[PDB]
Design an enzyme around this catalytic site. Structure first.
Site, PDB file in Angstrom:
ATOM      1  N   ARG A 175       0.799  -1.263  -0.014  1.00  0.00           N
ATOM      2  CA  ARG A 175      -0.169  -0.085  -0.135  1.00  0.00           C
ATOM      3  C   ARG A 175       0.942   1.200  -0.039  1.00  0.00           C
ATOM      4  NH1 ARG A 175      -1.514   2.717   4.337  1.00  0.00           N
ATOM      5  NH2 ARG A 175      -0.188   2.420   6.086  1.00  0.00           N
ATOM      6  N   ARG A 179      -2.780  10.829   2.448  1.00  0.00           N
ATOM      7  CA  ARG A 179      -3.666  11.270   3.688  1.00  0.00           C
ATOM      8  C   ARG A 179      -4.502  12.144   2.770  1.00  0.00           C
ATOM      9  NH1 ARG A 179       0.986  13.061   8.359  1.00  0.00           N
ATOM     10  NH2 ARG A 179       2.134  10.980   8.173  1.00  0.00           N
ATOM     11  N   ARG A 256      22.419  -2.489   2.879  1.00  0.00           N
ATOM     12  CA  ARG A 256      22.874  -1.157   2.260  1.00  0.00           C
ATOM     13  C   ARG A 256      23.645  -0.264   3.536  1.00  0.00           C
ATOM     14  NH1 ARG A 256      22.288  -1.146  -2.525  1.00  0.00           N
ATOM     15  NH2 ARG A 256      22.307   1.211  -2.612  1.00  0.00           N
ATOM     16  N   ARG A 287      18.878  12.892   1.612  1.00  0.00           N
ATOM     17  CA  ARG A 287      18.337  13.976   2.308  1.00  0.00           C
ATOM     18  C   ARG A 287      19.397  14.754   3.014  1.00  0.00           C
ATOM     19  NH1 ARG A 287      17.089   9.165   6.499  1.00  0.00           N
ATOM     20  NH2 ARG A 287      16.272   7.824   5.106  1.00  0.00           N
ATOM     21  N   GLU A 312      23.172  12.777   3.136  1.00  0.00           N
ATOM     22  CA  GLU A 312      23.291  11.462   3.130  1.00  0.00           C
ATOM     23  C   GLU A 312      23.066  10.664   1.818  1.00  0.00           C
ATOM     24  OE1 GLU A 312      19.822  10.225   5.771  1.00  0.00           O
ATOM     25  OE2 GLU A 312      19.567   8.758   4.159  1.00  0.00           O
ATOM     26  N   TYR A 363      15.604  -4.220  10.092  1.00  0.00           N
ATOM     27  CA  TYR A 363      15.588  -3.049  10.759  1.00  0.00           C
ATOM     28  C   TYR A 363      14.483  -2.795  11.796  1.00  0.00           C
ATOM     29  CZ  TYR A 363      14.821   2.020  10.975  1.00  0.00           C
ATOM     30  OH  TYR A 363      14.730   3.156  11.734  1.00  0.00           O
ATOM     31  N   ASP A 365      13.202  -0.015  14.518  1.00  0.00           N
ATOM     32  CA  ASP A 365      13.074   1.405  15.226  1.00  0.00           C
ATOM     33  C   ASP A 365      13.564   1.274  16.891  1.00  0.00           C
ATOM     34  OD1 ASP A 365      12.023   2.990  13.155  1.00  0.00           O
ATOM     35  OD2 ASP A 365       9.972   2.560  13.665  1.00  0.00           O
TER      36      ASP A 365
HETATM   37  C1  LIG Z   1      20.978   5.015   9.734  1.00  0.00           C
HETATM   38  C2  LIG Z   1      19.855   4.738  11.012  1.00  0.00           C
HETATM   39  C3  LIG Z   1      18.900   5.726  11.266  1.00  0.00           C
HETATM   40  C4  LIG Z   1      18.083   5.420  12.257  1.00  0.00           C
HETATM   41  C5  LIG Z   1      18.079   4.026  12.823  1.00  0.00           C
HETATM   42  C6  LIG Z   1      19.154   3.130  12.523  1.00  0.00           C
HETATM   43  C7  LIG Z   1      19.992   3.510  11.761  1.00  0.00           C
HETATM   44  C8  LIG Z   1      21.055   2.524  11.308  1.00  0.00           C
HETATM   45  N1  LIG Z   1      17.240   3.510  13.810  1.00  0.00           N
HETATM   46  C9  LIG Z   1      17.377   2.206  14.544  1.00  0.00           C
HETATM   47  C10 LIG Z   1      17.921   2.524  15.888  1.00  0.00           C
HETATM   48  O1  LIG Z   1      19.436   2.597  15.647  1.00  0.00           O
HETATM   49  C11 LIG Z   1      17.795   1.216  17.075  1.00  0.00           C
HETATM   50  O2  LIG Z   1      18.373   1.797  18.073  1.00  0.00           O
HETATM   51  C12 LIG Z   1      18.534   0.204  16.503  1.00  0.00           C
HETATM   52  O3  LIG Z   1      18.073  -0.208  15.179  1.00  0.00           O
HETATM   53  C13 LIG Z   1      18.128  -0.831  17.434  1.00  0.00           C
HETATM   54  O4  LIG Z   1      18.819  -2.422  17.427  1.00  0.00           O
HETATM   55  P1  LIG Z   1      20.049  -2.650  18.074  1.00  0.00           P
HETATM   56  O5  LIG Z   1      19.833  -2.471  19.690  1.00  0.00           O
HETATM   57  O6  LIG Z   1      20.443  -4.051  17.595  1.00  0.00           O
HETATM   58  O7  LIG Z   1      20.958  -1.486  17.642  1.00  0.00           O
HETATM   59  P2  LIG Z   1      22.584  -1.489  17.370  1.00  0.00           P
HETATM   60  O8  LIG Z   1      22.376  -2.056  15.642  1.00  0.00           O
HETATM   61  O9  LIG Z   1      22.657   0.074  17.046  1.00  0.00           O
HETATM   62  O10 LIG Z   1      23.321  -2.137  18.115  1.00  0.00           O
HETATM   63  C14 LIG Z   1      24.545  -2.958  17.655  1.00  0.00           C
HETATM   64  C15 LIG Z   1      25.551  -2.988  18.427  1.00  0.00           C
HETATM   65  O11 LIG Z   1      26.170  -4.161  18.469  1.00  0.00           O
HETATM   66  C16 LIG Z   1      27.522  -3.915  18.504  1.00  0.00           C
HETATM   67  N2  LIG Z   1      28.171  -4.984  17.976  1.00  0.00           N
HETATM   68  C17 LIG Z   1      28.360  -5.524  16.925  1.00  0.00           C
HETATM   69  N3  LIG Z   1      29.177  -6.868  16.636  1.00  0.00           N
HETATM   70  C18 LIG Z   1      29.881  -6.703  17.860  1.00  0.00           C
HETATM   71  C19 LIG Z   1      30.554  -7.461  18.378  1.00  0.00           C
HETATM   72  N4  LIG Z   1      31.130  -8.752  17.520  1.00  0.00           N
HETATM   73  N5  LIG Z   1      31.142  -7.489  19.632  1.00  0.00           N
HETATM   74  C20 LIG Z   1      30.816  -6.445  20.336  1.00  0.00           C
HETATM   75  N6  LIG Z   1      29.807  -5.615  19.896  1.00  0.00           N
HETATM   76  C21 LIG Z   1      29.132  -5.850  18.629  1.00  0.00           C
HETATM   77  C22 LIG Z   1      27.632  -2.897  17.310  1.00  0.00           C
HETATM   78  O12 LIG Z   1      28.969  -2.077  17.390  1.00  0.00           O
HETATM   79  C23 LIG Z   1      26.529  -1.895  17.761  1.00  0.00           C
HETATM   80  O13 LIG Z   1      26.826  -1.138  18.843  1.00  0.00           O
HETATM   81  C24 LIG Z   1      16.146   4.560  14.165  1.00  0.00           C
HETATM   82  N7  LIG Z   1      15.121   4.061  15.243  1.00  0.00           N
HETATM   83  C25 LIG Z   1      14.050   5.204  15.561  1.00  0.00           C
HETATM   84  O14 LIG Z   1      13.332   4.979  16.424  1.00  0.00           O
HETATM   85  N8  LIG Z   1      14.143   6.329  14.909  1.00  0.00           N
HETATM   86  C26 LIG Z   1      15.087   6.775  13.815  1.00  0.00           C
HETATM   87  O15 LIG Z   1      14.772   7.789  13.266  1.00  0.00           O
HETATM   88  C27 LIG Z   1      15.872   5.783  13.435  1.00  0.00           C
HETATM   89  N9  LIG Z   1      16.962   6.128  12.553  1.00  0.00           N
HETATM   90  O1  LIG Z   2      14.440   6.668   7.362  1.00  0.00           O
HETATM   91  C1  LIG Z   2      14.609   5.525   8.008  1.00  0.00           C
HETATM   92  O2  LIG Z   2      15.252   5.740   9.091  1.00  0.00           O
HETATM   93  C2  LIG Z   2      14.191   4.479   7.437  1.00  0.00           C
HETATM   94  C3  LIG Z   2      13.507   4.207   5.990  1.00  0.00           C
HETATM   95  S1  LIG Z   2      11.918   4.065   6.168  1.00  0.00           S
HETATM   96  C4  LIG Z   2      11.753   2.373   6.454  1.00  0.00           C
HETATM   97  N1  LIG Z   2      10.722   1.543   7.140  1.00  0.00           N
HETATM   98  N2  LIG Z   2      11.037   0.243   7.166  1.00  0.00           N
HETATM   99  C5  LIG Z   2      12.036   0.146   6.377  1.00  0.00           C
HETATM  100  C6  LIG Z   2      12.809  -0.989   5.961  1.00  0.00           C
HETATM  101  C7  LIG Z   2      12.321  -2.301   5.981  1.00  0.00           C
HETATM  102  C8  LIG Z   2      13.333  -3.166   5.639  1.00  0.00           C
HETATM  103  C9  LIG Z   2      14.494  -2.899   5.129  1.00  0.00           C
HETATM  104  S2  LIG Z   2      14.584  -1.015   5.616  1.00  0.00           S
HETATM  105  N3  LIG Z   2      12.562   1.446   6.038  1.00  0.00           N
HETATM  106  N4  LIG Z   2      13.599   1.973   5.343  1.00  0.00           N
HETATM  107  C10 LIG Z   2      14.281   3.363   5.331  1.00  0.00           C
HETATM  108  C11 LIG Z   2      15.394   3.274   4.447  1.00  0.00           C
HETATM  109  C12 LIG Z   2      15.461   2.211   3.731  1.00  0.00           C
HETATM  110  C13 LIG Z   2      17.002   1.927   2.938  1.00  0.00           C
HETATM  111  C14 LIG Z   2      17.684   3.141   2.876  1.00  0.00           C
HETATM  112 CL1  LIG Z   2      19.116   3.143   1.785  1.00  0.00          CL
HETATM  113  C15 LIG Z   2      17.344   4.273   3.476  1.00  0.00           C
HETATM  114  C16 LIG Z   2      16.126   4.375   4.309  1.00  0.00           C
END
Ligand SMILES: Cc1cc2c(cc1C)N(C[C@H](O)[C@H](O)[C@H](O)COP(=O)(O)OP(=O)(O)OC[C@H]1O[C@@H](n3cnc4c(N)ncnc43)[C@H](O)[C@@H]1O)c1[nH]c(=O)[nH]c(=O)c1N2
Ligand SMILES: O=C(O)C[C@@H]1Sc2nnc(-c3cccs3)n2N=C1c1ccc(Cl)cc1
Ligand SMILES: Cc1cc2c(cc1C)N(C[C@H](O)[C@H](O)[C@H](O)COP(=O)(O)OP(=O)(O)OC[C@H]1O[C@@H](n3cnc4c(N)ncnc43)[C@H](O)[C@@H]1O)c1[nH]c(=O)[nH]c(=O)c1N2
Ligand SMILES: O=C(O)C[C@@H]1Sc2nnc(-c3cccs3)n2N=C1c1ccc(Cl)cc1
Lengths: 386, 386
Positions: A175, A179, A256, A287, A312, A363, A365
Site C-alpha cells: 500500500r 492522507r 545497504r 536527504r 546522506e 531493521y 526502530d
Molecule cells: C542510519 C540509521 C537511522 C536510524 C536508525 C538506525 C540507523 C542505522 N534507527 C534504529 C536505531 O538505531 C535502533 O536503536 C537500532 O536499530 C536498535 O537495534 P540494536 O539495539 O540492535 O541497535 P544497534 O544495531 O545500534 O546495536 C548493535 C551494537 O552491537 C555492536 N556490535 C556488533 N558486533 C559486535 C561484536 N562482535 N562485539 C561487540 N559488539 C558488537 C555494535 O557495535 C553496535 O553498537 C532509528 N530508530 C528510531 O526509532 N528512529 C529513527 O529515526 C532511527 N533512525
Molecule cells: O528513514 C529511516 O530511518 C528508514 C527508512 S523508512 C523504513 N521503514 N521500514 C524500512 C525498512 C524495511 C526493511 C529494510 S529497510 N525502512 N527503510 C528506510 C530506508 C531504507 C533504505 C535506505 Cl538506503 C534508507 C532508508
C-alpha cells in the site's frame, strides 16, 4: 564466576536487556561492545566547532504508541516536545510531505477537498489494476497514479535501493497511502520526542547500574573463549551480525550502508527545517539533515551564524562499511532462513539468544527494539537466569 | 451580609476572580450572569446531530507562556497535545500559513532558502521605506512587499474591520513578521492545548466551589439595587460593558462582532484541517472552522460520514450583539478616556471594580484575562476586601 549474563552489543536492544536483568533480577551483566561508545547507531555527540548535537550514524527520532516502552524509556531521560515533520524537494520545490492535501495542491496546482482528492487519486491510479501489476513500478502506479509515482517515488527509490523499480517485484508495496487531510505530522504515534539532554546521555544512563560492567572497544569473537570459560553458566544475548556469528557458512547477508558528508556552514540556517528529502535523480544524496533544528529549545546555546548539515548517500554495504538496512533479495531471504535455523539450535543448545537489528537481519526502530528486548527478557531471560 | 463580593459575568476574568476569592481567602461570592451558561464566549457544547464539540461564539484556542496561569488553569482541567495550525485560501490554493518558506515557495513558485527568502522579502518591500508610508496599507507594503500584501493582507483586513487599509493610520502596524524557516506552528507560546473534556466542563469546575453560588439568566442591572442593599459593603467586580454601565452617557463604544453560520454536512471531512482562512474578497466569510479537527483523539466518538462547520462573518456590533474586538477609532478613544474617569470615580466611592474585555474596552486572550484577573485579585482585591 564473574557474570550471570553476557550481552554482546551496546544498542538499545542490548542495553534494555542488560538493564532489566541488572535492576529487576539483581543479576550481574557484562556488556561487550565493539565500538568506543555505548548506544550503537543511536549515539550522538557535539560537533566540535558549533557544539550542536549531531548523529554520525544517521538521524534518530524517538516515537512510540506503546505506553510500557514510553514509561520505561522515560526512566532514563526526559523528552522534548519535538514533532518530526519532513519536506520533499522535487524540481526545486519543497513539497509538504507525506503525500496529502498540501502536496496535492502544490503538485496539481489547486486546492482539493478531502473528497475531491480521494476521487483524484482513484482517477489517476486507475491506469493499472493492482491485480495486473507485474512489478514495483506498476504496483505503485496502480496505487497513486503515474504522475505522483514519477515525481516522488521512482527516483527516490532508485537512490535508496540502487535498483530500477521496474525491476523490483510488485509485492514489495502492499500500500501507498495518501492522507486526505492537511496533517503532516510524520509519525502517528502517541508519544514522540527527542532526549532533552541528547542521546548519549540517555544511553549512558541505561548502562549506569551497579550490576552492569561495560566493556567498550572489545570484539566478542576475540574474547568469547575466555568469557565463556569463566562464566560457563551465563547465557548470552548476542546482537551482533547473525551471519558473522556462524562464520558466514551460508554466505553473506546483503545490507545497504549510508555515507554522511558533514559540513559546518557560515550561515545560521541552511534549510529552515531538520530534514529535507531530495526525491530527484539529479542530486545524488537522499536527504540533508540540519541538526540545530532538532533542538529548537537550544537556540540560545546555538551559534548565531553557523549551522551543521549532513548530506546522506545510499550505497551497497561492502567490506568495512557499517551495515544499516537489510536488502532482502531472494538469496538474502533463503540465506536468512538457514541462519535462522542455525540460531534456533544455538539458542537451545548454547543459551545464546539472538536479538536486535543485526542479530536478526531486520531493521528495528528504537522503540521496536526496546519492545523486542522487553519481550525477550520476559519470555526467555527470567527463566534462563532463574 | 450574605456575600463578601459580587462578580458580574461568568467569563474567564470573572471565574478567576470568584474562584481566587472562594478557594484562597474563603469569602462567599455571588456571580450574576445575563446568559444561560458559564464561560462567556469560551463555552462549548455538543452539536446535536453529530455530537461534536463546537463553540457557538467562536473557536477558542488555549496557549500561554505564563507558568502560573498554566498551573492555575490545569487545576480545573486537562489539555490535549493539540497545536494550532492555519491555512490560507487564496485564488483557490490553500497556503501554508504564517508567511514563511512554505508560503513563499507556493507563492513565488520555487524553493527559497532562509537566506534567499530574506533577500526576496527585502527587495520586494524596498518599494516603500518604513518612515515614509501614510497609512497602514503602505506600512504593510513597506514590510513585506506589495504582492504578498495584496494576496494575504489587504482584502482579509478589509473584511474584518470593514475599512480601507489605506485609510487606517500607519501606526497600526509596527512589525509584520515573515518566518525564514518552515515552522508553521501558529502560536509560539510554551504551553498549548484544548480541554480534553470540553470547555463547558472546565468552566463548571472553576465555579463549582462552596463559597461560590451563581445565578444564570440574571441581569446585574435588573437586580443590583436589592443585592447591593442586602450585601452592602461587598465590593463588585464588574466585567460587563464599560459604556452600558454608565448608560452610554458619553457614547457607544465601537466593537466588532462575529456571526456564525453553522452547517452539518454529509461528509466526514469538509476541508481536512480545523481552520481555513479565506483571504480573498469574493468570500463574505473570513474563516471556516471544521470542529472535528480540534479533537482528533475522538475520531471514534465522531461520526464518519458527518461533520459540522462554521462560516465566520465580521460585522459592527449592535447593542445586544456580543462584543468581540474593540475598534479604537479616535472617537472611541476619546469616549474611552471619559468612561475611565467615570469608572475610577465609581470604584473609589462605590467599590465597583472594572475588569475584563467588556469592562476595560480591551481585547483579552483567555490567558491574558486570567493573568489580568489574578493581578487585580492581588493588587486591588485581597488588599481591600480584608
Ligand atoms: C542510519 C540509521 C537511522 C536510524 C536508525 C538506525 C540507523 C542505522 N534507527 C534504529 C536505531 O538505531 C535502533 O536503536 C537500532 O536499530 C536498535 O537495534 P540494536 O539495539 O540492535 O541497535 P544497534 O544495531 O545500534 O546495536 C548493535 C551494537 O552491537 C555492536 N556490535 C556488533 N558486533 C559486535 C561484536 N562482535 N562485539 C561487540 N559488539 C558488537 C555494535 O557495535 C553496535 O553498537 C532509528 N530508530 C528510531 O526509532 N528512529 C529513527 O529515526 C532511527 N533512525
Ligand atoms: O528513514 C529511516 O530511518 C528508514 C527508512 S523508512 C523504513 N521503514 N521500514 C524500512 C525498512 C524495511 C526493511 C529494510 S529497510 N525502512 N527503510 C528506510 C530506508 C531504507 C533504505 C535506505 Cl538506503 C534508507 C532508508
Ligand atoms: C469570538 C471570540 C473568539 C475568541 C475570544 C473571544 C471572542 C468573543 N477569546 C477571548 C475569550 O473568550 C475571553 O476573553 C474570555 O472568556 C475571558 O474574557 P472576559 O471574561 O473578560 O470577557 P467575557 O465576555 O468572557 O466575560 C463577561 C461575560 O459576562 C456576561 N455579561 C455581560 N453583561 C452582563 C450583565 N449586565 N450582567 C450579567 N452578566 C453579564 C457576558 O455573557 C460576558 O460574556 C479567545 N481567547 C483565546 O485565548 N483564544 C481564542 O481563540 C479566543 N477566541
Ligand atoms: O483570532 C482571534 O481570536 C483574534 C484576532 S487576532 C488578534 N490579536 N489581537 C487582536 C486585537 C487587538 C485589538 C483589537 S483586536 N486581534 N484581533 C483578531 C481579530 C480582529 C478582528 C476580527 Cl473581525 C477578527 C479577529
Amino acid at each position: 564466576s564473574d557474570f550471570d549474563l553476557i550481552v554482546v552489543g551496546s544498542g538499545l536492544f542490548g542495553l534494555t536487556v542488560a538493564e532489566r536483568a541488572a535492576s529487576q533480577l539483581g543479576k550481574k551483566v557484562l556488556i561487550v561492545e565493539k565500538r568506543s561508545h555505548l548506544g550503537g547507531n543511536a549515539y550522538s555527540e557535539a560537533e566540535p566547532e558549533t557544539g550542536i548535537e549531531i548523529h554520525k550514524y544517521g538521524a534518530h527520532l524517538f516515537h512510540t504508541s506503546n505506553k510500557r516502552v514510553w514509561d520505561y524509556v522515560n526512566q532514563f531521560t526526559a523528552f522534548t516536545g519535538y514533532q518530526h515533520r519532513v519536506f520533499a524537494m522535487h524540481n526545486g520545490t519543497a513539497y509538504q510531505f507525506p503525500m496529502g492535501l498540501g502536496l496535492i495542491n502544490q503538485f496539481f496546482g489547486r486546492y482539493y477537498t478531502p473528497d475531491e482528492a480521494r476521487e483524484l487519486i482513484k482517477e489517476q491510479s486507475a491506469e493499472i489494476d493492482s491485480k495486473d501489476a507485474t512489478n514495483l513500478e506498476e504496483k505503485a502506479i496502480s496505487l497513486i497514479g503515474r504522475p505522483l509515482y514519477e515525481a516522488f517515488i521512482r527516483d527516490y527509490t532508485a537512490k535508496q535501493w540502487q535498483t530500477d523499480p521496474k525491476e523490483l517485484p510488485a509485492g514489495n508495496i502492499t500500500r501507498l497511502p495518501v492522507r486526505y487531510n492537511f496533517d503532516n505530522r510524520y509519525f502517528n504515534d502517541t508519544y514522540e520526542g527527542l532526549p532533552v539532554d541528547g542521546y548519549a546521555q540517555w544511553l549512558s544512563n541505561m548502562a549506569d547500574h551497579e550490576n552492569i560492567e561495560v566493556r567498550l572497544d572489545t570484539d566478542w569473537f576475540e574474547v568469547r573463549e575466555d568469557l565463556r570459560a569463566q562464566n560457563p553458566e551465563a547465557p548470552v544475548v548476542y546482537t551482533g551480525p547473525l551471519d558473522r556469528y556462524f562464520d558466514y557458512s551460508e554466505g553473506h547477508l546483503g545490507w545497504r550502508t549510508l555515507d554522511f558528508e558533514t559540513e559546518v556552514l557560515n550561515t545560521g540556517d541552511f534549510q529552515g527545517t531538520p530534514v529535507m528529502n531530495y526525491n530527484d535523480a539529479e542530486f545524488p544524496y537522499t536527504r540533508i539533515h540540519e541538526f540545530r533544528h532538532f533542538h529548537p529549545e537550544r537556540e540560545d546555546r546555538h551559534p548565531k551564524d553557523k549551522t551543521v548539515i549532513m548530506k546522506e548517500y545510499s550505497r551497497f554495504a561492502e567490506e568495512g562499511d557499517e551495515p544499516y538496512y537489510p536488502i532482502n533479495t531472494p538469496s538474502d531471504r533463503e540465506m536468512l532462513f538457514k541462519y535462522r535455523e542455525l540460531a534456533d539450535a544455538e539458542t537451545e543448545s548454547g543459551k545464546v539468544y539472538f536479538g536486535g537489528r543485526l542479530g536478526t537481519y531486520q531493521y528495528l526502530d528504537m522503540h521496536m527494539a526496546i519492545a523486542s528486548a522487553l519481550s525477550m527478557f520476559d519470555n526467555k531471560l527470567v527463566d534462563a537466569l532463574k
